Ligand binder design. Structure first.
Ligand SMILES: NC(=O)c1ccc[n+]([C@@H]2O[C@H](COP(=O)([O-])OP(=O)(O)OC[C@H]3O[C@@H](n4cnc5c(N)ncnc54)[C@H](O)[C@@H]3O)[C@@H](O)[C@H]2O)c1
Ligand SMILES: NC(=O)c1ccc[n+]([C@@H]2O[C@H](COP(=O)([O-])OP(=O)(O)OC[C@H]3O[C@@H](n4cnc5c(N)ncnc54)[C@H](O)[C@@H]3O)[C@@H](O)[C@H]2O)c1
Lengths: 245, 248
């Protein structure tokens, strides 16, 4: 069975709750010594603490992916704690609706959080993954990187670059032994903006009939970073119930 | 005929030579009042001059897409001269091969140069186009934006961003009577490119191109005139790809 991560070291950025927290637990159960990592270092310690409870291998760290210094620390910490880096899940990020006349700080920040971050980390992680003989990079994109809508300037155009970054950098680090893929999630039960009348709307145009649950992405991350996705690269697997939200 | 820009006002960044030249040069003969702009200040003026020379209305001005001072200056300086804004051609842009380990300074700059700026100017002209009833914004992408190859991270993902921005902000300025399009151009045999091109490379770039010739700056401009004129009045959000059916 190829859906495992035996003898693997995985950084997961942004993994204190939600998808990150989920990818972390799932990779740790898959057999990977997880470097849990978030901006809020205590929940990051808890997720890594939790994985330790269940018999897993993990250390929990602080890392504002937007902080170059933090990136180089996390990268250094992983090697100092597990000896190698073979998997990186760039899940930290975010976004939302903004007006067309939004302030640019909001704008440029999105490409710092959602793109600049994960590209730089991929740069820092790449040569180590090479030494191990190969690795895998997973960028958590969004359905906004595909979709087309009002008030979607920043959140849309940012995450569409992360897709198309994923497509191309595969050609760069492919030769070093590295796969690069992307998961574009739909809406996830992760809630302050949710109400049952918006729900039926969100559930319109969603063929599978439900919103998402973070183990949905987490399950897809395991696949795309495991040997079951061993010849897969340059891709963007959209997990959104057959629809938009 | 609807392939015209009669009594329109077009801010056209990056327009001192090559493409942006032929855009601003073509929009001229299409009865447009052009604001020829480029980061060389003489370069824009020299072009507005030949336009005025051949029959046109055009003022030469200096703008650095990646400079806010220059952006707010171009909106007003066009308005003060023609009253209104009806066309914004964000032809100013850049990029090319870059190794994977490139310095983050290079990576950010291509976004500053290709996205952020474009987006900002188009924030600016959008309520002034709204006064004139409506207009057309045009971005210049690149086949880097859909294509995938080695050393394309900065060049490729940024134009990609440009593209899907075009796809999304058209829902925003779409009710303001504005339409957003973009063109991904293939390789354009310009004067700049010719001087570092060669027949043996050109033959390489061209095999796997079905039409069998390089692009030329007018080919982008013909498409730019169509996309900005009423002859595409119900066309918006689009990313038209002028590359002869292939990649280069
Ligand atoms: N959850 C969704 O509905 C949804 C939908 C589409 C796309 N996404 C994508 O998933 C990713 C995150 O989804 P989410 O809802 O789990 O995220 P979120 O923003 O709700 O936060 C999840 C975790 O990310 C951490 N985090 C936030 N900023 C960080 C930073 N600068 N550095 C490190 N960690 C940080 C938080 O501490 C938190 O534990 C984003 O990249 C987003 O584009 C999510
Ligand atoms: N082969 C091609 O020419 C080709 C192919 C695909 C896409 N494009 C796109 O066309 C656009 C540029 O065309 P080009 O290749 O002739 O570029 P270029 O560099 O050859 O010249 C374009 C003009 O833009 C001006 N310029 C440069 N930086 C500027 C700035 N910060 N502000 C304002 N003006 C500036 C330059 O002076 C130049 O005259 C870019 O968006 C590029 O991505 C070009």
């Amino acid at each position: 069975s190829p859906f495992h991560l035996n003898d693997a070291v995985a950084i997961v950025t942004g993994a204190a709750a939600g998808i990150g927290r989920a990818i972390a637990g799932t990779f740790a159960k898959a057999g990977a010594s997880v470097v849990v990592t978030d901006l809020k270092s205590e929940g990051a310690e808890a997720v890594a603490a939790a994985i330790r409870q269940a018999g897993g291998k993990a250390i929990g760290l602080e890392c504002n992916v937007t902080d170059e210094q933090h990136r180089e620390a996390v990268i250094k910490a992983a090697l100092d704690q597990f000896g190698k880096i073979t998997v990186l899940v760039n899940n930290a990020g975010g976004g939302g609706p903004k007006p067309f006349d939004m302030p640019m700080s909001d704008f440029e920040w999105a490409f710092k959080l959602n793109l600049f971050s994960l590209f730089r980390l991929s740069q820092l992680a790449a040569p180590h993954m090479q030494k191990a003989g190969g690795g895998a990079i997973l960028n958590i994109s969004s359905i906004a990187g595909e979709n087309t809508n009002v008030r979607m300037a920043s959140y849309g155009s940012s995450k569409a670059a992360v897709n198309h970054l994923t497509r191309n950098i595969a050609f760069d680090v492919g030769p070093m032994g590295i796969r690069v893929n992307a998961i574009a999630p739909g809406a996830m039960k992760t809630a302050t903006v949710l109400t049952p009348e918006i729900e039926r709307a969100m559930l319109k145009h969603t063929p599978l009939g439900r919103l998402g649950e973070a183990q949905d992405i987490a399950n897809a991350a395991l696949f795309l970073c495991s040997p079951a996705a061993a010849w897969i690269s340059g891709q963007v697997l959209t997990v959104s119930g057959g629809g938009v939200q």
